[PDB]
């Protein structure tokens, strides 16, 4: 027994064909079975024909006959159909409202999550369907990982380099950092974990969590997990206050945080607030400074990734009493300078998926573009806070959507928080970029920030762009543009100072070729998010939707503190770069 996801109506039915088995009320369960292919229904029992060796599961072809369920062929003389009178038969038949359109719930329940429109719907439907969609999508995502063939160590060629043998009659996953494997040792009667791993084309290059002397027979699967059901909304109800509530501001603050004092007061004057921090504007500075502005306030600092939490820890370590901090870790190497797993500590740093059930004066949720509605609900379920602060940038990269192929996902659809920031705007905006030369700040200000992002630094005169299509080659799941790497090689010979530069591209295969030919450190745009480097060399590689994505392009060029070279494929983004154009040698 549970709650209809459409009505909330109390009910004893769950759709058995829906992978999450939502509870549906007699009405909603009917409207759902008669208007989709979903025909298996679960109660306290499953509406299936309890006749010996009959295969009838369709609820519309079954009858209660006694206290058992039968099809037409096997039913007793005295029976009533399970599925008639615009209603499906179960407990609480007299408390049931329904809905005018079940259309959104069917779409969410049936879609394969390959189309953008599926994520658009999942983020614009009612709040209870946002939770159903977020569970359905995440279960569809964790199941898809099982579709992928086992990789097995056939030969250990070197250290850091392997020969894999793949399971037959199943696809092989892409070999980039968005697909993290787990190794396993061949035992007496079972297997035991042996750290997590990633792979890249050679033979294959492997950069595993821990070191080992792994040998033939060791194999790898993308580790999936149980998706738990959601209960809490993606956002609590907003409340605006006329005074700061449940927070006591400091009388003496330092001029390091004095630029945020007005924003800190705003945080205390509503239930949740959104902070848009463009690249190098001071998001973590903001977050730690909030502690010093409300010194008595218990603050839980959270984010999706261990890296995002550890970077809050690194900033705390520099401003907060260490004795007053704790890093929560579940039973991967992260921050090890606080007492571990001290929930009652005044400053708690913890990933979403590891959060304890606790209360706080303020919850700070960082790198919000990377959050899903699933993460948003989990935070609200674990943390009851006087105030919630969501810090991020909807102009930066979202969580990868491994099933999406048809369509692009616009920032207003990344999650509920990003939707607010792109429709009503953010509560707070960090308007000064301290990282990047003015040429890069002017470019991204016009590209994605409605000309509101201002440069601290002057022009560097070291921001350059080349329009060169080159030649595009494709491997199993990535792109290469050798001529664009050639152009960079010629550029380095004439400009040898740029040999301390970081190589960035949209493709891991472009990066592997560049690493060998140039010897620069490489990062995918996606892996560079949150990092900064003095000099950046960027090859667009292709003009695809992936390489032309404005959020990706915005992250790519805002990695640079001093100088950047962009080898561009797309005439559009080339023309938008406020960089010195260079001829082709
Ligand atoms: C003025 C210019 O400075 C650079 C210094 C470092 C890099 C890199 N990478 C590029 C350029 C020079 N050294 O010619
Ligand atoms: Zn269903
Ligand atoms: Zn219902
Ligand atoms: Zn039967």
Residue carrying structure tokens 């007492």? 339
The pairing of beta strand 46-47 with beta strand 62-64: unpaired
* Residues whose CB falls within 8 Å of the CB of residue 494, separated by 6 or more in sequence, listed in order: 585
Structural domain for 537, as ranges: 433-581
With contact defined as beta carbons under 8 Å apart, do 403 and 115 qualify? no
Residue nearest to atom 6 of ligand 1 (CA): 497
575 CA → ligand 1 middle, Å: 25
Nearest C-alpha neighbor of 409 from the set 575, 549, 202 = 549
Query: Does the annotation list 29 as a binding residue?
Result: no
Nearest C-alpha neighbor of 343 from the set 328, 332, 364, 333 = 328
Residue carrying structure tokens 């140039």? 518
Helices (H), 57-205: 103-110, 116-124, 127-146
Atom of ligand 1 nearest to the CA of 495: 14
528 CA → ligand 2 middle, Å: 40
497 CA → ligand 1 middle, Å: 4
Q: Which ligand is nearest to the CA of 463?
A: 1
With a 6 Å cutoff on the Cβ, whether 500 touches ligand 1 is: yes
With a 6 Å cutoff on the Cβ, whether 563 touches ligand 1 is: yes
Q: Which two tokens stand for residue 165?
A: 């043998």
Tally of CB atoms within 10 A around 149: 16
> Which residues face 473 on adjacent strands?
480
* Spatial distance between the Cα atoms of 400 and 420, rounded to a whole number of angstroms: 20
With a 6 Å cutoff on the Cβ, whether 491 touches ligand 1 is: no
Q: Which ligand is nearest to the CA of 51?
A: 4
Q: Which ligand is nearest to the CA of 105?
A: 2
Q: Which two tokens stand for residue 72?
A: 């037409």
32 CA → ligand 3 middle, Å: 10
Nearest C-alpha neighbor of 311 from the set 286, 293, 330, 341 = 286
With a 6 Å cutoff on the Cβ, whether 267 touches ligand 1 is: no
Q: Which ligand is nearest to the CA of 32?
A: 2
199 CA → ligand 1 middle, Å: 33
Q: What angle do CA 14, 16, 19 make, to 5 degrees?
A: 100
* Spatial distance between the Cα atoms of 100 and 534, rounded to a whole number of angstroms: 58
74 CA → ligand 4 middle, Å: 5
With contact defined as beta carbons under 8 Å apart, do 388 and 236 qualify? yes
- CATH number, domain with residue 477: 3.40.50.300
Residue to mutate (ligand 1; options 488, 492, 498; most atoms within 8 A of CB): 498
With contact defined as beta carbons under 8 Å apart, do 413 and 119 qualify? yes
* Spatial distance between the Cα atoms of 514 and 509, rounded to a whole number of angstroms: 9
* Residues whose CB falls within 8 Å of the CB of residue 423, separated by 6 or more in sequence, listed in order: 412
Query: Does the annotation list 271 as a binding residue?
Result: no
* Spatial distance between the Cα atoms of 436 and 439, rounded to a whole number of angstroms: 8
DSSP 81: E
Structure determination technique employed: X-ray
* Spatial distance between the Cα atoms of 558 and 546, rounded to a whole number of angstroms: 18
Q: What angle do CA 33, 36, 37 make, to 5 degrees?
A: 90
73 CA → ligand 4 middle, Å: 6
Q: H or E segment at 301?
A: strand 299-303
> Which residues face 15 on adjacent strands?
41
| Cα dihedral across residues 496, 498, 499, 503: positive or negative | negative
With contact defined as beta carbons under 8 Å apart, do 184 and 191 qualify? yes
Helices (H), 274-372: 283-293, 306-317
* Spatial distance between the Cα atoms of 520 and 259, rounded to a whole number of angstroms: 38
With contact defined as beta carbons under 8 Å apart, do 374 and 530 qualify? no
* Spatial distance between the Cα atoms of 142 and 381, rounded to a whole number of angstroms: 21
Longest dimension (CA), the chain: 93
Query: Does the annotation list 281 as a binding residue?
Result: yes
The pairing of beta strand 299-303 with beta strand 358-365: parallel
With a 6 Å cutoff on the Cβ, whether 461 touches ligand 1 is: no
Q: H or E segment at 418?
A: helix 416-423
């Amino acid at each position: 027994v549970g709650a209809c996801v459409l009505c909330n109506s109390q009910t004893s039915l769950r759709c058995g064909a829906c992978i999450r088995r939502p509870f549906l009320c007699c009405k909603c369960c009917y409207d759902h079975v008669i208007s989709t292919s979903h025909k298996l229904v679960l109660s306290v029992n499953p509406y299936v024909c309890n006749a010996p060796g009959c295969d009838v599961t369709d609820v519309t072809q079954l009858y209660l006959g006694g206290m058992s369920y039968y099809c037409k062929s096997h039913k007793p003389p005295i029976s009533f159909p399970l599925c008639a009178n615009g209603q499906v038969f179960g407990l609480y038949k007299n408390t049931c409202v329904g809905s005018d359109n079940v259309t959104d719930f069917n779409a969410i329940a049936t879609c394969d999550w390959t189309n953008a429109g599926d994520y658009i719907l999942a983020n614009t439907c009612t709040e209870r369907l946002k939770l159903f969609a977020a569970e359905t999508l995440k279960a569809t995502e964790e199941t898809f990982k099982l579709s992928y063939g086992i990789a097995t160590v056939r030969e250990v060629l070197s250290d850091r380099e392997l020969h894999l043998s793949w399971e037959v009659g199943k696809p092989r996953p892409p070999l980039n950092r968005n697909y993290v494997f787990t190794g396993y040792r061949v035992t007496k009667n079972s297997k035991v974990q042996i750290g997590e791993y990633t792979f890249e084309k050679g033979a294959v290059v492997y950069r595993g969590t821990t070191t080992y002397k792994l040998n033939v027979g060791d194999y790898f699967v993308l580790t999936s997990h149980t998706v738990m059901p959601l209960s809490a909304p993606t956002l609590v109800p907003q409340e605006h206050y006329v005074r700061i509530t449940g927070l006591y501001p400091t009388l003496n603050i330092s001029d390091e945080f004095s630029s945020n004092v007005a924003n800190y007061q705003k945080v205390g004057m509503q239930k949740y607030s959104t902070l848009q921090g463009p690249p190098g504007t001071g998001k973590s500075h903001f977050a730690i400074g909030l502690a010093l502005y409300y010194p008595s306030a218990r603050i839980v600092y959270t984010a999706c990734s261990h890296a995002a939490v550890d970077a809050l820890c690194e900033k705390a370590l520099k401003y907060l009493p260490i004795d007053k901090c704790s890093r929560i870790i579940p039973a991967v190497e992260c921050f090890d300078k606080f007492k571990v797993n001290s929930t009652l500590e005044q400053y708690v740093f913890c990933t979403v998926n590891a959060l304890p059930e606790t209360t706080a004066d303020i919850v700070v949720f960082d790198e919000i573009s990377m959050a899903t509605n699933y993460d948003l609900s989990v935070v609200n379920a674990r943390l009851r806070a006087k105030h919630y602060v969501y810090i991020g940038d909807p102009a930066q990269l979202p969580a990868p959507r491994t099933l999406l192929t048809k369509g692009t996902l616009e920032p207003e659809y990344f999650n509920s928080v990003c939707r607010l920031m792109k429709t009503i705007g953010p509560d707070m905006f960090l308007g000064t970029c301290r990282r990047c030369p003015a040429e890069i700040v002017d470019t991204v200000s016009a590209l994605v920030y409605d000309n509101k992002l201002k440069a601290h630094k002057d022009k560097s005169a070291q921001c350059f762009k080349m329009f060169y299509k080159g030649v595009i080659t494709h491997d199993v799941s990535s792109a290469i543009n050798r001529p664009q790497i050639g152009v960079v090689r010629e550029f380095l010979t004439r400009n040898p100072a740029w040999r301390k530069a970081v190589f960035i591209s949209p493709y891991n295969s472009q990066n592997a070729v560049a690493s060998k030919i140039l010897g620069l450190p490489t990062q995918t745009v996606d892996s560079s998010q949150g990092s900064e480097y003095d000099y950046v060399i960027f090859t667009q590689t292709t003009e695809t939707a992936h390489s032309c994505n404005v959020n990706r392009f915005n992250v790519a060029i805002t990695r640079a503190k001093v100088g950047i070279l962009c080898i561009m494929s797309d005439r559009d983004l080339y023309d938008k770069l406020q960089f010195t154009s260079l001829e082709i040698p």
